[PDB]
Amino acid sequence: DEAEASKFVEEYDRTSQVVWNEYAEANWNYNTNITTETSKILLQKNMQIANHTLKYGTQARKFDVNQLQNTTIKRIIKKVQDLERAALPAQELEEYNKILLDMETTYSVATVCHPNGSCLQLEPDLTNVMATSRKYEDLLWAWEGWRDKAGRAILQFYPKYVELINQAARLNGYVDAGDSWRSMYETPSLEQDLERLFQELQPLYLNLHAYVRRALHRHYGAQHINLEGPIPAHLLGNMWAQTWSNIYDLVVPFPSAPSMDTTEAMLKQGWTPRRMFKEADDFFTSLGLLPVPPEFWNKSMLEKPTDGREVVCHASAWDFYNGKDFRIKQCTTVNLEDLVVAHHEMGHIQYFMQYKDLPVALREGANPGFHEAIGDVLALSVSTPKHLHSLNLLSSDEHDINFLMKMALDKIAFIPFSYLVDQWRWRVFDGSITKENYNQEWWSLRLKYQGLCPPVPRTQGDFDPGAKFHIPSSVPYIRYFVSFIIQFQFHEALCQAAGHTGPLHKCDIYQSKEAGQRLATAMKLGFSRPWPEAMQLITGQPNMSASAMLSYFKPLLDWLRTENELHGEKLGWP
Ligand SMILES: C[C@H](N[C@@H](CCc1ccccc1)C(=O)O)C(=O)N1CCC[C@H]1C(=O)O
Ligand SMILES: [Cl-]
Numbered sequence: 001d002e003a004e005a006s007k008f009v010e011e012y013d014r015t016s017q018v019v020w021n022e023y024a025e026a027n028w029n030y031n032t033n034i035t036t037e038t039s040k041i042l043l044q045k046n047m048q049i050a051n052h053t054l055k056y057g058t059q060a061r062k063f064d065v066n067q068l069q070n071t072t073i074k075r076i077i078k079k080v081q082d083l084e085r086a087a088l089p090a091q092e093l094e095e096y097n098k099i100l101l102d103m104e105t106t107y108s109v110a111t112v113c114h115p116n117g118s119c120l121q122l123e124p125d126l127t128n129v130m131a132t133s134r135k136y137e138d139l140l141w142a143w144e145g146w147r148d149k150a151g152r153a154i155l156q157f158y159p160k161y162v163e164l165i166n167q168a169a170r171l172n173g174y175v176d177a178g179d180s181w182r183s184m185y186e187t188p189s190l191e192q193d194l195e196r197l198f199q200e201l202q203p204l205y206l207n208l209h210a211y212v213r214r215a216l217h218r219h220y221g222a223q224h225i226n227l228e229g230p231i232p233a234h235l236l237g238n239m240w241a242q243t244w245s246n247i248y249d250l251v252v253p254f255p256s257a258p259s260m261d262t263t264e265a266m267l268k269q270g271w272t273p274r275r276m277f278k279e280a281d282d283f284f285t286s287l288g289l290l291p292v293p294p295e296f297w298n299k300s301m302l303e304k305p306t307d308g309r310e311v312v313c314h315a316s317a318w319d320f321y322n323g324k325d326f327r328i329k330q331c332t333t334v335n336l337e338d339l340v341v342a343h344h345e346m347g348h349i350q351y352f353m354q355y356k357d358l359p360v361a362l363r364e365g366a367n368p369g370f371h372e373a374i375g376d377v378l379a380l381s382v383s384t385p386k387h388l389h390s391l392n393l394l395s396s397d398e399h400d401i402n403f404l405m406k407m408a409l410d411k412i413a414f415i416p417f418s419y420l421v422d423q424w425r426w427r428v429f430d431g432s433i434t435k436e437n438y439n440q441e442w443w444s445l446r447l448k449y450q451g452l453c454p455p456v457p458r459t460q461g462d463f464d465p466g467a468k469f470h471i472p473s474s475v476p477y478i479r480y481f482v483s484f485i486i487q488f489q490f491h492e493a494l495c496q497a498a499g500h501t502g503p504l505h506k507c508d509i510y511q512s513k514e515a516g517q518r519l520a521t522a523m524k525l526g527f528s529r530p531w532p533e534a535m536q537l538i539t540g541q542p543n544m545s546a547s548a549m550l551s552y553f554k555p556l557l558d559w560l561r562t563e564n565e566l567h568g569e570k571l572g573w574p
């Protein structure tokens, strides 16, 4: 029957390309122009792609994968047997698709208004307030307001969403949706592996947390900061306190060594969103990697539209499954934070182009984390003082500690948050957390892992998780935790291949062909082989390891311990 198998995969591939390309079209139109019309069309297309999935998935299940000889065919067919949402009865499928659409629309058009009439959208208004305001009450207004308008509005849809996504998972052979999502890593030991990694980063996070807590105590006052407790969630310069880069000014280790206004420098010399992506595109090509197609610059939405249409601003990279059309949709703002995001997204695009010739079923990253790490790796080099100086955006061991601190505020602060999100969802999916306890358990984890507390007590009806994009958008989050760990492993390996010597944090792989080759060879595998092989190709070993990230920040860890020790900090919280 081996003959029927290769034939099946061939038909699945050519037909999937057509249907998936049409779907991406409708999805893009909705995402870049939210209207009743584009919404209705997208929902119609959902039913069409579902019909295709059910047709080929039903056939795939007729094959006994065990008796299949060719490992590539065996792998593709096993994957096609998973119908995902298409496994749901037609009635539940349309209800599920509408719920997803409603949650996405609700989140993307939510606004927080003042008594007068001035209403602010998340991007860039509220994001700017959280990043620049140093007034406790103004930060509270934005923090609470976003949750009141976005979070609370998602609550009416979540319980049903959970019921339906779990039903689909069970109909595909999994115990629940969390089980289904975790399966993407093909790693039985996943939960234990990630827990060990999280634990290895505790010394660093706890020391950074204590140091930043002391700084906030200095700025906002003893009456608002408990030196032995959690930090109010609205003072970290970010709506979700997932990255603390924006309060660098309040915590700079050596204020005597001033650093240029990077964001002001970009604006000062006319940097634009297009320039930002052009620079990222240049970094990739410098490594010998692929440049984005001409079509990319013509079809991407790199700026928030001003023609009246409403859009999903949250940045994302798109593969239209025809090996030629790739696009990015981002409401880009001119600043260093979004420059890094630009590289992040361009990393996804590079992966798309690298595996474009593989069967559609295998056009995915070695694991989701790999897809998320590519752009971040290059951004690590872009963020170095020397590289920023080469871009004319910047002009001592102290400058070194300041830099590591800036890097830690983003990378280290994000570790517990990235770990937390799916620890919460997996327990919602497995029934451990009911709708009565959604919010309470979210905050229990926010405290346990991040050491944060809500500035305003939560009340019945609040659903703070809904105020975070990936929740109503139903996008898994553990990939970001994996990404932050492995991106440093990649940085370390690529730097070693590039001939770098000395402190790892001083490495800049710009123009390194050796580094480019390692990334390309790995990306070309797509999802054709277990991820340890792609890991081996890049790093020379097959496991995930926190050693690289710890090595990168070693100088900061030493500095933080000394600093916290002399101030008598009590690490942690009750
Ligand atoms: C800006 C970026 N966007 C997402 C998009 C996710 C997504 C998947 C499927 C459909 C729409 C959006 C991405 O990974 O590119 C993002 O959300 N990131 C990057 C790092 C951490 C995470 C965050 O900001 O929470
Ligand atoms: Cl929150």
Ligand SMILES: [Cl-]
Residues within 6 Å of the ligand: 181, 184, 368, 369, 476, 477, 478, 479
């Ligand atoms: Cl994931």
Ligand SMILES: [Zn+2]
Residues within 6 Å of the ligand: 344, 345, 348, 371, 372
């Ligand atoms: Zn990403």
